[PDB]
Structure 1
Amino acid sequence: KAQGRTVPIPGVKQALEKKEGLFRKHMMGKRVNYAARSVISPDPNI
């Protein structure tokens, strides 16, 4: 909603809707503590 300056600096509306948005990227979904990731391997003995 601002005039073109000879990519502009994002406004507070842009901050809440950067990509998916603050609500989708940091409220509905979040990075968590006490969690791990690894490639799975098969095992019939467990």
Structure 2
Amino acid sequence: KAQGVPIPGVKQALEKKEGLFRKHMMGKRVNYAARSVISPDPNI
């Protein structure tokens, strides 16, 4: 709603891709967490 790549406005900051609400409020990167390939085990 300007020009016609320009610098993004505060509206653009809240809706960059999915948005601040979706990318950083409804979903978040977390502490005390780990990721690994799973391997089968019938003894546990």
Q: TM-score category by the smaller chain?
A: over 0.9
- Count of equivalent residues: 44
Percent sequence identity is: 100
Name stretches of at least 5 consecutive residues in structure 1 with no aligned partner. Answer: none
Segments of 4+ in structure 1 off by > 4 A?
A: none
TM norm structure 1: 0.88
Give me the CA root mean square deviation.
0.9
Larger strand proportion, structure 1 or 2? 2
TM norm structure 2: 0.92
